[model samples]
Target: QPKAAPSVTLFPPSSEELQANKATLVCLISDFYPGAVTVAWKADSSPVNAGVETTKPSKQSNNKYAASSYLSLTPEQWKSHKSYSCQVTHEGSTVEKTVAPAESSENLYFQ
Candidate 1:
């Protein structure tokens, strides 16, 4: 059984200084119950019409299933006080999480 519905989480960049070519956006999403799923980038609340990478579960652990996707964007973009969303869908449920740019570099690596 799955612990919960699939969720999209956008992690903060690894640095406080936003360089023109050294910054990036990191997103991690997965489903631990239903094995087949898709998570992708969306523009204006819609998918950006790209082939998002998806990984099929190689082996089941204790009768559990999962799939994960990683998305990275170069030279991150964020308006002052703007928000971006990381969404997930499975079994007819859509989960959307909107996050703003973090002010600290401490959370850059959220385990």
Candidate 2:
């Protein structure tokens, strides 16, 4: 069977939470098979290694898999960065979703 490509959805921190000096960006990976995927985060196209948490793929009711990756940052860090991206690689194909501070309260979807 051929491998399935995962779809990615990006969620930015709440506007109210930004004022608290802490923010979290969530990346949701869903509806993929084989339970194998690579998740990465970047700030302004630069790789971010710290403050990133990724969950292992979980089996879904449809036999597919779902997972989530989180990137945590302070309000100052979020404001300083131009863009933050979550990149997911599955079956040699990558899907990326990005969010910016200006649009931080909205949910972002990859094209």
Candidate 3:
């Protein structure tokens, strides 16, 4: 069987909860086959290990696979970093989704 590349979607912390001191960024990986993928977090292009968690791949309705990664950080960390990214590696292919503090006005105030 041929390998299927994964697709990645990165979600920033909820803007409505900006007043909270803690924040979580979600990375959704979907539509991949072989059930094996490596998920990693990066802050400003550098690898980050703390406060990161990834779930095992779960079978999807369409027979593909999906997984999720969460990166926990303080609002101060999110605000200070120039960019945060989630990278998923599947079958030797890598997909990345990134978010930046200055990307949108809604994401500017991290409290």
Candidate 4:
């Protein structure tokens, strides 16, 4: 038996970030296979040119690889109450998803 490859892991947003402006959402779709991943940030269920950024996964000493997606925005974007997406395109599997806003403290890592 074989294992399936991992796609982007749509991490959650932070509570403080939820209170930010509409342009501050910064949806980061990560843990991707850099060669075949595309992440988009959608607003009000629509796609925007303010698009995806990628960081090729670096291999760890433990023999695991992990990639990252980045999106940064102004205060306005983060507060708009619009939806966003973390779409992953790979191995003929176009796995895409959207995240609605919620009262979450999930992304509060930086100081």
- Ordered by lDDT, highest first, the candidates read 3, 2, 1, 4
In candidate 3, stretches whose alpha carbon ends up further than 4 angstroms from where it belongs are 15-17, 99-111
The true-versus-predicted C-alpha distance at residue 25 of model 2, in Å, is 0.7
lDDT value for candidate 4? 0.49
**Local accuracy by lDDT, each model:** 0.51, 0.71, 0.72, 0.49
Per-residue alpha-carbon lDDT of candidate 3 for residues 12-101, written as tens digits (9 for 90 to 100) = 677655556567878877788756877677776457766788778888787878888888787667667665778788777775666554
lDDT per residue as tens, model 2, 32-66: 76677776777764677678887888877877888
| Cα lDDT for residue 101, candidate 3 | 43
Please report how far candidate 4 places residue 60 from its true position, in Å.
Answer: 5.2
lDDT of 1 at 80: 26
Candidate 4 per-residue lDDT, tens place, 1-111, comes to 122344444444445763443233343333434334455555554555455566666644544455657666544454454456555555556555556555453433443
Q: Could you estimate the TM-score for every candidate?
A: 0.56, 0.72, 0.74, 0.53
Instruction: Enumerate clash totals for all models, in the order shown.
Output: 0, 0, 0, 14
What lDDT score is found at residue 57 in candidate 3?
Answer: 83
Whichever of 2 and 4 has more TM-score, that candidate is: 2
Q: What is candidate 2's TM-score against the reference?
A: 0.72
Pick by lDDT: 3 or 4, better one: 3
